[PDB]
Each structure stands twice: as C-alpha cells, then as structure tokens.
From Swiss-Prot:
Changing residue 31 to A: In strain: Mu/B.1.621. It is a multi-pass membrane protein. This is Papain-like protease nsp3. Residues 1-167 form the Macro domain. It is found in: Host endoplasmic reticulum membrane. Responsible for the cleavages located at the N-terminus of the replicase polyprotein. Participates together with nsp4 in the assembly of virally-induced cytoplasmic double-membrane vesicles necessary for viral replication. Antagonizes innate immune induction of type I interferon by blocking the phosphorylation, dimerization and subsequent nuclear translocation of host IRF3. Also prevents host NF-kappa-B signaling. In addition, PL-PRO possesses a deubiquitinating/deISGylating activity and processes both 'Lys-48'- and 'Lys-63'-linked polyubiquitin chains from cellular substrates. Inhibited in vitro by GRL-0617. May form homohexamers. Interacts with N protein. It catalyses: Thiol-dependent hydrolysis of ester, thioester, amide, peptide and isopeptide bonds formed by the C-terminal Gly of ubiquitin (a 76-residue protein attached to proteins as an intracellular targeting signal).
Length: 167
C-alpha cells in the first residue's frame, strides 16, 4: 500500500491520472520522481522547467555540478540526483526529442531506467515539447516498465484521450 490517490489502473503495475506532476510530488513526496530531462540537464521548459522552478532552481544548481563532473547523459540514459523538496530522489531520464531528430526507438531504452526503482511518479517520456505521440509513449511504458509507475498526464484533454484509447 502506498499514498498515491485517484489513479486509474491500466495494468498490473501502471497507473495513470490527469495531474500536475509538481503538485503531485509536493503532496505525495514519493521516493522517486522522474524528470523529463535532456542530456545537458538544462531544465528550461516542459516538466523539467516546472520541477526545477518548484525547487527554487536548486535542481539546476545540482545538475550543473553533475554535468561539470560527468559530462552529458546519453539519449535513453538517466542519472539519480536529489529530489529536493519534491521527493527523496529525482531520476532524470532522457527520452528522445523528436523536435531534435532523435531516434524514437530509444524511448524503450529510456523507460528501462524505471525498472531500477520499485515505485516511481513519472511523466510520459518524450511527450509534450519532446514531440512524440503520447499514445505511443504510454504503450512503450506499459510494455517496458515492470516496476510500479504512477503516470501524471498534465493535459486533461490528453488524459481523457489516453484513457479512452488504451488497449
Ligand atoms: O510532455 C508533456 C507536456 C508537459 N508534461 C507534464 N506532465 C506532467 N506534469 C507536468 N507538469 C508540468 C508539465 C507537465 C508532459
């Protein structure tokens, strides 16, 4: 039993809700919140910009030190950093950005990072400003993640479409 509330159950392990991931994280304080990161951990917009703003830029400060030490992530890769005031940990995961011409097959690799964590709050990878089809992202999520994932879909209109089209 966990403290996530109001989710629709899609499969044995995937749950979905129309919600703002920032406000959800602040309420639940999950062990792991997933960020929709880029390889440089430049949290400008989308989910990343919103999470960083909620940390008063502490996420960006920590991220800049991470990059200075380690260099960029790989597309499809991830790193674990602090969750600041939002969660114990933040798993920064880089899904392909279609608006940069990145390979969509890497979306499965991106979701595989979730399997290293027993429970996560997460967005649909590569959705929103990353330019992928959210229905496809949800399909890859369900077919790749085996751990317990609580998906927050910000757009209510998008949430309703995701539920009604789910196979
Ligand atoms: O890529 C799409 C576009 C934005 N996005 C989000 N998902 C869940 N919570 C969020 N809060 C702020 C943005 C956001 C997914």
């Amino acid at each position: 039993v966990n403290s996530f509330s109001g989710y629709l159950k899609l499969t044995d392990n995937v749950y979905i809700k129309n919600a703002d991931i920032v406000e959800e994280a602040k309420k639940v304080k999950p062990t792991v919140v997933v960020n929709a990161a880029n390889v440089y951990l430049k949290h400008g917009g989308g989910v990343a910009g919103a999470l960083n703003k909620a940390t008063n830029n502490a996420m960006q400060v920590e991220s800049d030190d991470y990059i200075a030490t380690n260099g960029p992530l790989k597309v499809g890769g991830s790193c674990v950093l602090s969750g600041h005031n939002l969660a114990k940990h933040c798993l920064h995961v880089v899904g392909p950005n279609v608006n940069k011409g990145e390979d969509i097959q890497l979306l499965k690799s991106a979701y595989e990072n979730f399997n290293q964590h027993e429970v996560l709050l997460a967005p649909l990878l590569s959705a929103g400003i990353f330019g992928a089809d959210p229905i496809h992202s949800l399909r890859v999520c369900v077919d790749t993640v085996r751990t317990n994932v609580y998906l927050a879909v910000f757009d209510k209109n998008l949430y309703d479409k995701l539920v009604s089209s789910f196979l």
